[PDB]
Symmetry: D2
């Protein structure tokens, strides 16, 4: 599909971290998040969902994914979810907003969740 092939590939965010994703025919997203320096200890699994049959009116394709910040050697006791849309074309983009929740005590729950935005450009 157009949505499937568009989303699949390697993306870089504006901080230079790297989002490697495959989109499946069933709406699944799978891949890896890794840091700008490329470090093996810097790689984390991601999973999410996308709209496999987007509107045909020039709108983007909705999607979201999660990374929990645990891998074989690190654990930051936190997870980020990216919610956004894929916009195809020459200079395709994925435009997202994100929520990063850390595990906290209930007294510190008000400081549990960061918010931000990341824009990805496709490298290949």
């Amino acid at each position: 599909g157009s949505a499937e092939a568009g989303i699949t590939g390697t993306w870089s965010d504006q901080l230079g971290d790297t989002f490697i994703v495959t989109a499946g025919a069933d709406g699944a997203l799978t891949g890896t998040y890794e840091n700008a320096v490329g470090n093996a200890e810097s790689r984390y699994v991601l999973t999410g969902r996308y709209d496999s049959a987007p509107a045909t009116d020039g709108s983007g394709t909705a999607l979201g994914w999660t990374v929990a910040w645990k891998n074989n050697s690190k654990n930051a006791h936190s997870a980020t979810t990216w919610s956004g849309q894929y916009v195809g074309g020459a200079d395709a983009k994925i435009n997202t907003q994100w929520l990063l929740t850390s595990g906290t005590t209930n007294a510190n729950a008000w400081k549990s969740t960061l918010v931000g935005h990341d824009t990805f450009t496709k490298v290949k």
Copy 2:
């Protein structure tokens, strides 16, 4: 693990919608979101990640998941991501914030993304 068994089960949000989840040993979350009514036409796949080795200091367990709002009969061209933490105990909860992005044109992208919060209570 305590994280794995705690998260697994059926949760209800404060709108009365139903979140059925299984947590795996590898950090995966899988399940289904359904409406308060119960309807098969109301059921959607979810996927996400959690911290499978949370801190042992009374903090919650970080997690996130995504639903793309396409099933076999409906497509709302959108996806929600929930970011939050599981808090165990007798009165266990999953406390979350969410981002719901719709596919839009670039001109309407400023109105693409809703934000909110959902608190879940475990029913089984």
Copy 3:
């Protein structure tokens, strides 16, 4: 006006912190945020805006306000904005979501902004 009178007063959030607000005919909000303790060195100025002529169809009244966390005795180099709606009736509420930005270096800007939610009830 109905919106003016319903918003004006003293409000408590679910953390037990105190919000004293006056709404003006021109859509201005002014007041003070104070801690759950009561402390005079924990009082900060608030300013904001509300819809002085809301819909009469059962909809809430849109509003927002800002606290910068500097007073004569303390400076936490940060500001919170609450965005939400006032809902009148028997047990009137202000339901909000908030963003708290701390001043940071560009390198730490991804850690600059917390998000959360506060529900206020009016104190008699």
Copy 4:
């Protein structure tokens, strides 16, 4: 004050809308939001707060403000709060995230609040 002078002026967002603001010695912000096309019917009051004594370690200056979308000619029954930081130097910016709540019925409250982000550049 450096923060007072830096913040005071006319700013344009990435959508080309115009924010005219004055920062006062007491931490107050006041001004006007205006649309990309300049329209006097499209001007709305803003009020907010900023940290009048920011850190001098390279950190930005925290601030926030609100616009309620009512003026003499229009009422969109909603309000936006911007939360962010001013970053000085040669290429000065205000980086923000925002929440836009519309007045809704309780049934529709999950669709009440949009979130996004706006970066401003100074015009003069």
